[PDB]
């Protein structure tokens, strides 16, 4: 999955998240078309109560069906401040997309972090099942100790997401941030 954001000189904004699902999808090119084929079907619930590649589960609602669109977690998002487009964000990450974007919004609104600060801050995640509080490297040992005392089952795992965001200033000025988790990416303007 990959997400990108755009804001033009007139103030129009677009947030796009698209994907083949896993990296390179099936890894299958369609004949001589040079086009790689997705493996999005794994986003359906193959059997009630059994998890998919992201640990997500389902039942009737997200069951496989002809012509049906498999449930996604993709969250291209725009936040409005004072009636104007303020934050344009999104991110890849399967089940983690929801919490990654959620954190960008919280970091921006509740903690008043600038777009780069919100982007470089560490991320955590809990998706109910599995029952574990997933965290990236970056949280204080004092904090993780308190979480464990509260009953959380802390699990240190791989970095989560690749946010590509743009914040719009009250004067039209643009502020952007690519993710430290993704090398060779870029936020640029004019």
């Amino acid at each position: 999955t990959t997400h990108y954001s755009v804001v033009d000189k007139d103030g129009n904004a677009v947030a796009v998240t698209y994907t083949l699902n896993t990296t390179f999808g099936t890894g299958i090119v369609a004949g001589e078309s040079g086009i790689l084929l997705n493996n999005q079907m794994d986003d359906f619930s193959a059997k009630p109560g059994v998890p998919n590649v992201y640990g997500l589960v389902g039942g009737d609602a997200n069951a496989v069906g002809p012509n049906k669109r498999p449930l996604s977690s993709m969250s291209p998002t725009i936040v409005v401040k004072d009636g104007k487009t303020w934050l344009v964000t999104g991110s890849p990450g399967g089940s983690r997309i929801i919490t990654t974007v959620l954190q960008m919004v919280v970091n921006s609104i509740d903690y008043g972090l600038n777009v780069a600060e919100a982007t470089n801050a560490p991320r955590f995640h809990h998706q109910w099942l599995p029952d574990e509080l997933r965290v990236e490297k970056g949280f204080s040992p004092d904090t993780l100790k308190l979480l464990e005392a509260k009953g959380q089952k802390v699990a240190l795992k791989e970095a989560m997401g690749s946010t590509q965001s743009i914040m719009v200033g009250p004067d039209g000025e643009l502020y952007g941030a690519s993710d430290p988790r993704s090398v060779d990416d870029l936020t640029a303007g004019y």
Binding site: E32, L36, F44, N67, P70, P76, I97, H126, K150, L186
Partner: protein, 350 residues
């Protein structure tokens, strides 16, 4: 005061996972294209420079907000083949086989990206498809240098699937190994596909030569996507799911995506706590959010699906009173095991 500094610009800006694609988007803006024009150009460029996820053979979502405030969502999520069935991924014993849903030809849904980009470009853009596809076309035809990101991905994830298919190996593998950083990746077949799309429009993908190539790849290898599937695919413009968090309005994707609903649901829950007070990286803030998240994911497992097939109780799920009922269950000093959490009872909020 800041350790982290954002990139700054006064006119336009593009943020993407790939430098080349970003520059493509910036050039389009500089040429006079609007955000949608640039967004489509970036999408086609990534389909060439970021084969890991950028694509023509996958799907996705687009959120568009005009300078006038008009906010809308474009659903170009893949559609399961018409021959798909509820138990298609189960083995003879009735247990799901991840190989079938992740590495076989049965794992693919009918691609929606081309359809989605054209729906958006035609209604909200200003440039013709050929103009926004051109940058991608040149990159595929003339090639580009493999960087660390692509080299790493080809070696790590690519090794598991690309070399197992002749046509894929012929493009991404070299001298028996994945392309290395510094090598040049030329994609002549993709260039042809791009050229035909630019000349004949999206129909080339859903009804033309590309469609034939997809249908044949499937027919020959036990796949299900047929020409009928491709001809029947359609991107769908849908009303965004949105909420209000401390006076800020949040817009995101509606079903078939669960993202918008749960981001709004969780923010609704969090609104009941003085998050700013706890602060980033505090045990209290993390505790509250982790707990809130559990309820949302439990709800996701039961109520979310393609809205054209099932009625999604999005109103109840994004109802602040419901959010309040969950917030009152959160003990900032004691986590509630997932075994004690089930999908909520929405009846009183519908």
């Amino acid at each position: 005061e800041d350790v982290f500094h954002p990139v700054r610009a006064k006119q336009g800006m593009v943020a993407s996972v790939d430098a080349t694609a970003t520059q493509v988007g910036v050039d389009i803006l500089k040429e006079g294209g609007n955000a949608v024009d640039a967004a489509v150009a970036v999408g086609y460029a990534l389909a060439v420079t970021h084969p890991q996820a950028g694509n023509l053979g996958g799907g996705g979502f687009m959120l568009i907000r005009s300078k006038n405030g008009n906010t809308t969502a474009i659903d170009f999520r893949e559609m399961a083949p018409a021959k798909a069935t509820r138990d298609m991924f189960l083995d003879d014993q009735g247990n799901p086989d991840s190989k079938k849903s992740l590495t076989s030809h049965l794992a693919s849904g009918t691609p929606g990206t081309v359809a989605g980009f054209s729906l958006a470009l035609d209604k909200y853009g200003t440039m013709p498809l050929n103009k926004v596809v051109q940058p991608a076309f040149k990159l595929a035809r003339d090639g580009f240098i493999v960087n660390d990101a692509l080299a790493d991905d080809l070696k790590t994830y690519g090794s598991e699937v690309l070399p197992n298919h002749e046509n894929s190996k012929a493009i991404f593998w070299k001298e028996g190994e994945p392309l290395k950083k510094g090598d040049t990746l030329v994609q002549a077949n993709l260039a042809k596909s791009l050229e035909m799309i630019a000349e004949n429009g999206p129909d080339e993908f859903y009804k033309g030569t590309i469609a034939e190539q997809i249908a044949q790849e499937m027919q020959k290898n036990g796949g299900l996507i047929t020409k009928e599937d491709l001809a029947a695919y359609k991107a769908v413009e849908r009303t965004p799911i949105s909420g209000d968090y401390r006076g800020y309005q949040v817009y995101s994707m509606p079903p078939p995506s669960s993202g918008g609903i749960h981001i709004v649901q969780i923010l609704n829950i969090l609104e009941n706590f003085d998050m700013k007070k706890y602060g980033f990286g505090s045990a209290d803030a993390m505790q509250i959010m982790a707990e809130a998240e559990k309820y949302a994911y439990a709800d996701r497992s039961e109520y979310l699906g393609d809205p054209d097939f099932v009625k999604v109780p999005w109103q109840a799920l994004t109802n602040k009173a419901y959010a309040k009922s969950i917030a009152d269950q959160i003990d900032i000093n004691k986590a509630k095991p997932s075994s004690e959490i089930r999908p909520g009872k929405l009846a009183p909020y519908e």
